[PDB]
Amino acid sequence: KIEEGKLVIWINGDKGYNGLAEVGKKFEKDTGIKVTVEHPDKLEEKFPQVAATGDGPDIIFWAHDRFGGYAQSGLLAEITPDKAFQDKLYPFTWDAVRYNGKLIAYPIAVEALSLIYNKDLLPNPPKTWEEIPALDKELKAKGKSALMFNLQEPYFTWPLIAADGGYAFKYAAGKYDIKDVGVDNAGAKAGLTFLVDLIKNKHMNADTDYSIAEAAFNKGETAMTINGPWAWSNIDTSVNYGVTVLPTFKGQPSKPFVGVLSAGINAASPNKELAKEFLENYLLTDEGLEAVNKDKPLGAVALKSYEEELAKDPRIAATMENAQKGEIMPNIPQMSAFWYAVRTAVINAASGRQTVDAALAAAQTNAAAMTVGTLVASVLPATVFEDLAYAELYSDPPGLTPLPEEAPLIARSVAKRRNEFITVRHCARIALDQLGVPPAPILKGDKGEPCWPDGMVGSLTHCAGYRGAVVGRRDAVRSVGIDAEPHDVLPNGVLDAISLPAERADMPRTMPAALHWDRILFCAKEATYKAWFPLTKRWLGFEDAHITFETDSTGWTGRFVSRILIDGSTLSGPPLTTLRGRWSVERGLVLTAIVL
Amino acid sequence: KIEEGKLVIWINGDKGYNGLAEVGKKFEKDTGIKVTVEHPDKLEEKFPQVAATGDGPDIIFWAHDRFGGYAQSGLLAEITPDKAFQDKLYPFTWDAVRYNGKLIAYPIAVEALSLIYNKDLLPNPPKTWEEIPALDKELKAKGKSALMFNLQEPYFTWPLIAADGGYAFKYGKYDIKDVGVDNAGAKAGLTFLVDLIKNKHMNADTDYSIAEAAFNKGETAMTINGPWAWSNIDTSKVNYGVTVLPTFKGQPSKPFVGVLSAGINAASPNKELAKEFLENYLLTDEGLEAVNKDKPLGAVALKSYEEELAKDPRIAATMENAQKGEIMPNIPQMSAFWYAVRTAVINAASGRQTVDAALAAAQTNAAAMTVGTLVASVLPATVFEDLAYAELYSDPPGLTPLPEEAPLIARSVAKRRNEFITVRHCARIALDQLGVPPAPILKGDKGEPCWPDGMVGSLTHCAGYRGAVVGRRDAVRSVGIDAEPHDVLPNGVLDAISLPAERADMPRTMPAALHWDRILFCAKEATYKAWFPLTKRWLGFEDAHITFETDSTGWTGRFVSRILIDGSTLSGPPLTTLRGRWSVERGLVLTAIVL
Ligand SMILES: CC(C)(COP(=O)(O)OP(=O)(O)OC[C@H]1O[C@@H](n2cnc3c(N)ncnc32)[C@H](O)[C@@H]1OP(=O)(O)O)[C@@H](O)C(=O)NCCC(=O)NCCS
Ligand SMILES: CC(C)(COP(=O)(O)OP(=O)(O)OC[C@H]1O[C@@H](n2cnc3c(N)ncnc32)[C@H](O)[C@@H]1OP(=O)(O)O)[C@@H](O)C(=O)NCCC(=O)NCCS
Ligand SMILES: OC[C@H]1O[C@H](O[C@H]2[C@H](O)[C@@H](O)[C@@H](O)O[C@@H]2CO)[C@H](O)[C@@H](O)[C@@H]1O
Ligand SMILES: OC[C@H]1O[C@H](O[C@H]2[C@H](O)[C@@H](O)[C@@H](O)O[C@@H]2CO)[C@H](O)[C@@H](O)[C@@H]1O
Ligand SMILES: [Mg+2]
Ligand SMILES: [Mg+2]
């Protein structure tokens, strides 16, 4: 339910969202249409999760790299600006938002990282990465540090990894080869090894994140940081700073990945024409962009008339100099896998979990395993999106490995078991990363129940043609149970063992004739057990729950309620007398989920 | 089936087993009774394992410290020497073999560790442990080392741990609640030892054969060993002396002193032949000499022969060290003490735990005595070299999971946490007996436990019991064990778990005292556990027809589980019939299947 006659906009919390809300107010005053701007955490991961249910914002702002994934899952409207409107924006910006022959967002601004330094602590910034250990030694003696920047997001480390030859996907003939991944070559290993040595030699701390680095720079405790244009506003309020070219590595320029902040329209919006009017006639004007830019700088904007003014800011000149040395990101759907793979490699190598060589070998494998599918998202409650995450795969990608801690669980297991175990736990680690949790082994405990990291709950499922994981923050979600089954009739004799007479009477009457209601019931019973057992530590048989279904008007998705016939007491907390879930049949599979 | 009219004797492979076999040949020549001497590995653990089934050797040789644990489980005959025979041995040696007022073994000889040195490399051995790092540095400059000894067995490191105040159980009786392995003296000793290793004066991997080889090849100037070691050194080119162990912080090293002793298996049908062999053949001047010439015994218990041995300066040094140490207790808690200290010395030496963490865990582990033999009574004695076990009837306080295991029970209820932790402590005790270092035991397919490479096993836990049995995979395909309380089954369960023919035939095969319904259930569960690792498929209660026999003794017997479904395995032959054993004791049913 996206509300008709209003706009909801998502944009990242480090950007000028208050400025954008001012453009929103102007729009309301002219047209009567209320504009609500929100900035949820991890919105780049939450958007598909909610847009899959037909929910979410009318308009989503993010760097262009994520948009191909959204388009592949059918989540974006096609954009068709007219001739005069296209001519108002730089051509390379339209190319950024073009995917498979269609425009999938409006380009807004060009972002690239620069080196930002405190001129009073450091009147001459370092030209090379290699001189930074020496500089940190000198600064540490004065009670300061040379450099702090966000080590938790690979965006900030990539310029160094790419400098001496790291790359994401090989480009040729206007086309990216997803089988030629450049994260494990000599150049990438050299850059990452330099970073890990900085940490080992106590020149940086592996836990430094965005807020830590920003606070340290803006209070004058560190001489340098690496950040984008959005960051300048907070500094300006604190420091006499310069924005300059990133240091070289092995004498080669650092090569940041360049983003074009872009605005896409939800394919489920009933407000597409209003969204287009807003973007074309209110935002992408000098006045609109100025409103946002004065809140937090956008970078070099896509609109030529205003970029001609901003280009005179020497901070923007520095921005474009670093952008020229770097590369525009791909927008292919495999980008989200690339990023997960590099995030994880960097974090594991920085913390000691893996050697650089192991961390990057694994990234090269993982960057293959794209997870932009949304089948299970369709059975999750959008209202709790901030505390849930998911990932799914429809095959077993080659070369995935279990974590060393997990390996004993499948050491004497059959091949199909080894594959489903490894693949589903990869999904689990992708989902956990969405909630901000680093890589952890997922072991098996009481009656085979999966063992989650502190503060997390979840569920796993694997059948023919599917592996999926859903994870939740335990401070908001008591338990999760999910289950996938092939959408086939049940084998002989199974329906009677798994069902009650009333279910057999009611369901064929309630469900569309096209659906294998027998298998759907069985899938829901299994999800019920998975949600149940972590909280009760007791058996629940198929005959111990009576499940009733309802069907949405689409005919392919709905709700169910499982009423428990035995003692529903839990070890702590409210009893599980009933459990509510959702079901969906799509792509040959049945998905069910319960979030308690 | 211990054979009547023959004697089988077990003694450790570091002792004079050939000499003992010579006394055996003389017996056979006089009496017509054949004597077979064997030296199984880990025989101190293997004896109770096989004797629990009424099998094993007629006579068991070991230091007296193990014998209380054997007596407690009813494994030894009381011995009946007359007063004239007792006056032939030293009184304090009889004291070592008296348990709850009864004599439970014949004493043979007094053993203590001494410092053994190469007179050509080191004509003035060091009086103190503190000089050894400097000596080593000097010798290393000549391609040599100062000292090597077995760091794998806590017997050898104990003298240093106890030097400055470590003790086992505080002594008219031993207080098992006052354990001294974690006081300041013990930590000082063990810290010294770990420091030797950190400073590259010794290596954590050094074991008995490694140290022996090095000393007898003249590569190291000193070792620490008992009298049994002397004959191998005689045969080598090394010119050696035997002397007082070095002091530590000015206090003498205090070895734990063993009395080698010979017990009689309570299940032996040859008790009078054993008595004759021991009293009239072995415990004579000539018998002890035969053994002593093979590998020296130490200061023997027989006064007439000790009169001769006491003139040897090596024996004088043995006794000097023995008097500075202490005779070991014979209380059944000794084997837990040794397991605790073993684990601690190995963990600290290797750096897996700090000295303080290691010794604090040892103080805890010294409480968890495992001398029970209920699951041992259902294990096949023919496979004893490749099986080990341990069981507990309670949850000892303060046991913890391995860190790798902790997530498996992080949100589990108290009773689950306890049973999980205690059973895995049992599993680690069993793995130790097979020479496998401590490992986590995780849970895999359908909850199956996850064993170290090359091992198989099974776990069980019910009210009043935790037990583990582990086997070497190259000899044992699968193990399934199961414990249940010996109670009638809940209403309706018998019909759910049994087949009609079982309900018809089983009551006729079992004595009136038994809950046959429960024993059937327990065997079915054991069958699944042996089955699943090999097949990875379900086996239902109606999918095996189990038949039973009972031994004449009435509380143990055999069963056969016949698989009624397809028996295909992941490898090897299909499962067809699985033979097991069952036992009922102390209100519990135990079952085991070893494939
Ligand atoms: C456990 C069970 C529900 C699994 O469902 P399934 O559809 O066969 O298999 P899926 O692949 O969807 O689920 C397998 C995953 O479930 C999870 N699971 C297993 N036991 C579990 C438990 N006790 N609690 C929670 N989750 C559990 C595991 O993560 C497992 O994957 P892993 O072994 O790779 O970790 C099913 O095998 C079963 O045993 N059902 C009996 C109980 C039941 O369904 N009762 C109905 C109540 S109305
Ligand atoms: C699994 C089962 C056999 C365990 O037996 P139990 O007597 O109830 O419980 P016990 O305490 O003796 O045994 C529990 C241990 O068995 C072991 N175990 C559990 N699942 C197992 C499997 N699939 N394969 C092998 N061993 C398994 C585990 O080590 C477990 O302890 P842990 O969880 O601490 O690691 C029983 O719970 C069960 O599910 N039985 C159904 C199948 C069956 O018995 N079929 C009859 C065949 S004729
Ligand atoms: O760290 C990987 C991350 O990098 C990029 O995200 C940038 C974003 O482009 C900027 O607008 C700014 O917000 O910081 C982000 C890094 O934290 C990619 O756009 C994104 O897909 C990727 O996950
Ligand atoms: O290492 C612990 C071990 O010490 C003693 O074992 C001795 C034994 O007494 C000697 O006769 C000789 O064989 O060396 C053994 C050490 O390897 C205890 O008697 C024994 O119970 C204990 O486990
Ligand atoms: Mg399923
Ligand atoms: Mg049981």
DSSP assignments along B532-565, one per residue: HHHH-S---GGGEEEEEEE-TTSSEEEEEEEE-S
State the best of B418, B423, B448, B450 to mutate against chain A, taking most chain A CBs within 10 Å.
B450
- Indicate whether residue B509 lines ligand 4 (CB < 6 A): no
Q: What are phi and psi of B398, to 5 degrees?
A: 85, 5
Distance, in Å, from the CA atom of A348 to the CA atom of A429, rounded to the nearest integer, reads 13
| CA B155 – ligand 4 centroid, Å | 6
- Tell me, which fold does domain B114-256+334-365 have in CATH? D-Maltodextrin-Binding Protein; domain 2 (3.40.190)
Token pair belonging to A444: 């098996």
State the best of A403, A412, A457, A571 to mutate against chain B, taking most chain B CBs within 10 Å.
A412
Report the relative pairing of strands B544-550 and B479-485 from DSSP bridges: unpaired
Q: What residues of A are in contact with residue B410 (Cβ under 8 Å)?
A: 445, 451, 454
For ligand 3, atom 15, the nearest C-alpha belongs to A155
| CA A284 – ligand 2 centroid, Å | 67
Torsion of the alpha carbons at A520, A525, A528 and A530, rounded to the nearest 10: -100
For ligand 4, atom 17, the nearest C-alpha belongs to B153
Q: How far is CA B448 from the centre of its chain?
A: 27
B200: left (phi over 0), alpha (psi -120 to 50) or beta: left
DSSP designation for A229:
G
β-bridge partners, A173: none
- For A12-42, the DSSP string reads -TTS-HHHHHHHHHHHHHHHS--EEEE--TT
Helices and strands in chain A: count of H runs, count of E runs: 20, 25
Contacts of B470 (CB under 8 A, 6+ apart): B387, B388, B389, B427, B430, B431, B434, B451, B455, B456, B457, B479
Strand, helix or coil at A142? coil
Q: What residues of B are in contact with residue A444 (Cβ under 8 Å)?
A: 408, 442-444, 447
Q: How far is CA B276 from the centre of its chain?
A: 28
Q: Is B140 on the interface with A (CB under 8 A)?
A: no
Residue type, B115: L
Token pair belonging to A56: 């979410």
- Looking at chain A, which residue has its C-alpha nearest residue B404? A405
> Shortest CB distance from A409 goes to which of B407, B450, B453?
B450
Q: How far is A435 from chain B (nearest CA, A)?
A: 20
DSSP designation for B442:
E
Q: How far is B453 from chain A (nearest CA, A)?
A: 9
The answer to whether the CB of B580 falls within 8 A of the CB of B558 is yes
Q: Is A448 on the interface with B (CB under 8 A)?
A: yes
Q: How far is B49 from chain A (nearest CA, A)?
A: 29
Helices and strands in chain B: count of H runs, count of E runs: 20, 25
If one residue of B14, B39, B64, B153 were mutated to test the ligand 4 pocket, choosing by the most ligand atoms within 8 A of its CB, it would be B153
Angle ∠(B392,B398,B401) on CA atoms, nearest 5: 80
- Indicate whether residue B541 lines ligand 2 (CB < 6 A): yes
Q: Is the dihedral of CA B56, B57, B62, B66 positive or negative?
A: positive
HSE-up (13 A, CA, CB side) for residue B188: 20
CB contact under 8 A, B536 and A571: no
Element (H, E) at A161: helix A158-163
* Residue B585 Cα distances to A411, B371, B394, angstroms: 37, 15, 16
The count of CB pairs under 8 A between chains A and B is 59
- For A373-411, the DSSP string reads --TTGGGS-GGGGGGEEEEEESS--TT----TTTGGGGT
The answer to whether the CB of B443 falls within 8 A of the CB of B450 is yes
- Looking at chain A, which residue has its C-alpha nearest residue B412? A446
CATH 3.40.190.10 is right for the domain spanning A114-257+335-366 = yes
Distance, in Å, from the CA atom of B297 to the CA atom of A512, rounded to the nearest integer, reads 89
Q: What are phi and psi of A167, to 5 degrees?
A: -145, 165
Q: How far is CA A596 from the centre of its chain?
A: 24
Give this entry's resolution in angstroms: 1.8
Q: What are phi and psi of B573, to 5 degrees?
A: -70, 155
Torsion of the alpha carbons at B512, B517, B518 and B523, rounded to the nearest 10: 110
The answer to whether the CB of B266 falls within 8 A of the CB of B77 is yes
The answer to whether the CB of B520 falls within 8 A of the CB of B498 is yes
Q: Is B127 on the interface with A (CB under 8 A)?
A: no
Distance, in Å, from the CA atom of A376 to the CA atom of A392, rounded to the nearest integer, reads 8
If one residue of A429, A447, A461 were mutated to test the ligand 1 pocket, choosing by the most ligand atoms within 8 A of its CB, it would be A461
Other beta carbons within 10 Å of A73: 17
Report the relative pairing of strands A388-393 and B326-327 from DSSP bridges: unpaired
Strand, helix or coil at B126? coil
| CA B584 – ligand 2 centroid, Å | 20
CB contact under 8 A, A414 and B442: no
Token pair belonging to B426: 């049992």
Closest ligand 4 atom number to CA of residue B62: 11
Q: What residues of A are in contact with residue B444 (Cβ under 8 Å)?
A: 408-413, 444
Distance, in Å, from the CA atom of A277 to the CA atom of A33, rounded to the nearest integer, reads 11
Taking Cα atoms as reference points, which of B98, B209, B107 lies closest to residue B153?
B209
Q: Is B493 on the interface with A (CB under 8 A)?
A: no
Distance, in Å, from the CA atom of A479 to the CA atom of B175, rounded to the nearest integer, reads 49
- The bound ligand whose nearest atom lies closest to the alpha carbon of B423 is 2
CB contact under 8 A, B445 and A417: yes
Angle ∠(A544,A547,A550) on CA atoms, nearest 5: 175
- Indicate whether residue B66 lines ligand 4 (CB < 6 A): yes
- Which residues of B are known binding-site members? 416, 424, 443-446, 460-461, 482-484, 525, 529, 539
CB contact under 8 A, A411 and B450: yes
CB contact under 8 A, B408 and A444: yes
For ligand 2, atom 35, the nearest C-alpha belongs to B449
Q: What are phi and psi of B214, to 5 degrees?
A: -60, -45
- Indicate whether residue B275 lines ligand 2 (CB < 6 A): no
Distance, in Å, from the CA atom of A266 to the CA atom of A269, rounded to the nearest integer, reads 5
Q: What residues of A are in contact with residue B570 (Cβ under 8 Å)?
A: 412, 414
Distance, in Å, from the CA atom of A94 to the CA atom of A98, rounded to the nearest integer, reads 6
β-bridge partners, B435: none
A485 is in an annotated binding site: yes
For ligand 1, atom 24, the nearest C-alpha belongs to A449
Distance, in Å, from the CA atom of B501 to the CA atom of A61, rounded to the nearest integer, reads 73
Taking Cα atoms as reference points, which of A64, A74, A68, A77 lies closest to residue A332?
A68
CB contact under 8 A, B412 and A447: no
Taking Cα atoms as reference points, which of A177, A159, A174 lies closest to residue A259?
A159
Other beta carbons within 10 Å of A371: 24
A483 is in an annotated binding site: yes
| CA A523 – ligand 5 centroid, Å | 6
| CA A260 – ligand 3 centroid, Å | 11
Residue B492, Cβ density class (10 Å: 0-12 exposed, 13-18 middle, ≥19 buried):
exposed
Taking Cα atoms as reference points, which of A579, A594, A545, A554 lies closest to residue A376?
A594
CB contact under 8 A, A451 and B412: no
Residue A471, Cβ density class (10 Å: 0-12 exposed, 13-18 middle, ≥19 buried):
buried
Contacts of B99 (CB under 8 A, 6+ apart): B67, B68, B71, B330
Distance, in Å, from the CA atom of A545 to the CA atom of A559, rounded to the nearest integer, reads 16
Contacts of A236 (CB under 8 A, 6+ apart): none
The answer to whether the CB of A393 falls within 8 A of the CB of A421 is no
Element (H, E) at A458: strand A456-463
